[PDB]
Symmetry: C5
């Protein structure tokens, strides 16, 4: 239904919880390929943590413009696990809100690719790392990116 | 009291929990028509999830303008059921704030059509899918859209 | 202490929990008139629910400007009672925040007239409907509107 | 440590929980004077409740500009105690966020002088009203106002 | 790897919980110099509390611009420990959201250096003050500042 061959898609991912992140990125990449998005047009860049996702996304989008290779959509990818402090709550809160607002500031679809889990098992399951359980959410984010960049043209 | 015969209403809905979504959409359509809105002027469009509703609404509104068929009001519809992670809470929080803010950005009424439930039964009951329980919240939203787009002319 | 004779005050109220709504409006109307605000200068208008209060207020204010009868302040009145789902939480949160911001966007005092209760009794008690318990919060909202429109002239 | 002899500081306080409010203001006033701020350059003004603090601060700042006596900093003082309903949570939430945002919109330091307590005992202790317990937070607010107005000139 | 030799990084830290604050700053300063940032190009400045961090950061950024020694990135540092009242919740929430927004308002990376802990031991552990327990989170913030200011040209 959706054609991604003409699109350039950016994936910006954190490096905290790298094992789970890698699996999510791979899924997003996989689904992008299935929609016809060219390999040269899947751009992957990293940031340290999820807090750096929103501003990192802006800087990433702006750099791509300056390069003459603008992005049609972006998938910020982060994994946050509930720890002992309230750090989890406040990172999740601020990140989710800014990424949402970033749809309008940037003028391109920003797909919420942040997992917000209470356990490591929960994040692993939603990254496809536990076999026979659930699915890789990265794949959904890939499909969402193509559609949102296409549907309303 | 309120006549919608000269109005063009947009409905944008998520695709997760499709059975409950379809019931709410139909309830909004049914009520829209009771206020006099013509079938040709009820425009239905989809996005994958509730996070995509706010920016999807923006792209939908701007598309209809470019087509020369501008929307007088929009009803973003989504269904969110509490899962095992905090994903429910941050999607609800961010989506709600942006849909609220979107009234002012888009310059047209944006009717909050997002169910934020704890059980599947609760969402079914609020879509009128339980024979004796409550009512279809979709109908209330249709009536809201007509009133909000007309009352202050 | 505050002369309200030269003021025009708008009251925008929701229609859900109407019995409690009516009493809060009645209290606001009473105290408004006690500070000298004339009946012809108290404009009452309605919206379906509390979510429509923020944008309804803007549309109400804009309409009153086009009529050549500008409002000096506005009191959005809503009654929200905790249900079974999270609907209460997300309506309250985004409604409160927008009404707060509306002070600066509209350039007139917006008095927070939204009850956020857990039981019907709590709302009734804070609306002056329980015989010997507490008072009608509506009156306080009336007093506030007059003061905020006058004190800093 | 900082010189406040050339500063004009405004104090805007709510009128609920007055006993505690008066103690908080008296602390702020006392500490202001210790930094060199003159009695004539400490302007006290009131609003009804904490919700009125944000916009009341704007109106207060603007009036002082029209009087030719601008403020170099403002200390919005409120006392909020948790009751039976959710009123506490939502007033605290939107007031704190708006007072924070007010720093950037007014262009002067806005010092958070709102106590957000669960009990009356807690507000009294944080106002210096309990003999062998803690200190008056109002003093800290007076120190903060002076510093934030001078340190970065 | 990132070259911080040409960078100027600012550190703005609160003063409450000084013992923990100092460890975080020392950790950030240390990592900065490992990435090649000169000691004349690491500017430390202070504010009273965490609530002053966002507006202090702007005042600090603007001051450095006026001096001809602009900042390429800023690390606002603060320590918040849960107390008896709801003070903790509302300072974390508004500070976190504003520091996040500040990335876009200032046009430089704003590294989130605020600990949001339930106990003192939790903050000590995340500052590297407990041997064999976790690490100094300050060190990450140093690295983040250098990466975010360089990676995207």
């Amino acid at each position: 239904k959706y054609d991604g061959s003409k699109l350039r898609i950016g994936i910006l991912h954190a490096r905290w919880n790298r094992k789970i992140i890698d699996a999510l990125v791979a899924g997003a990449v996989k689904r992008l390929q299935e929609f016809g998005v060219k390999e040269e047009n899947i751009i992957i860049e990293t940031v340290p943590g999820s807090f750096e996702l929103p501003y990192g996304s802006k800087l990433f989008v702006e750099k791509q413009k300056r390069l003459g290779k603008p992005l049609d959509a972006i998938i910020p990818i982060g994994v946050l696990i509930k720890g002992s402090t309230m750090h989890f709550e406040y990172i999740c809160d601020s990140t989710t809100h800014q990424l949402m607002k970033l749809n309008f500031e940037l003028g391109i679809p920003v797909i919420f690719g942040v997992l917000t889990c209470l356990t490591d098992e929960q994040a692993e399951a939603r990254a496809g790392l536990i076999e026979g359980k659930m699915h890789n959410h990265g794949e959904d984010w890939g499909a969402a990116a193509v559609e949102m960049a296409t549907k309303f043209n």
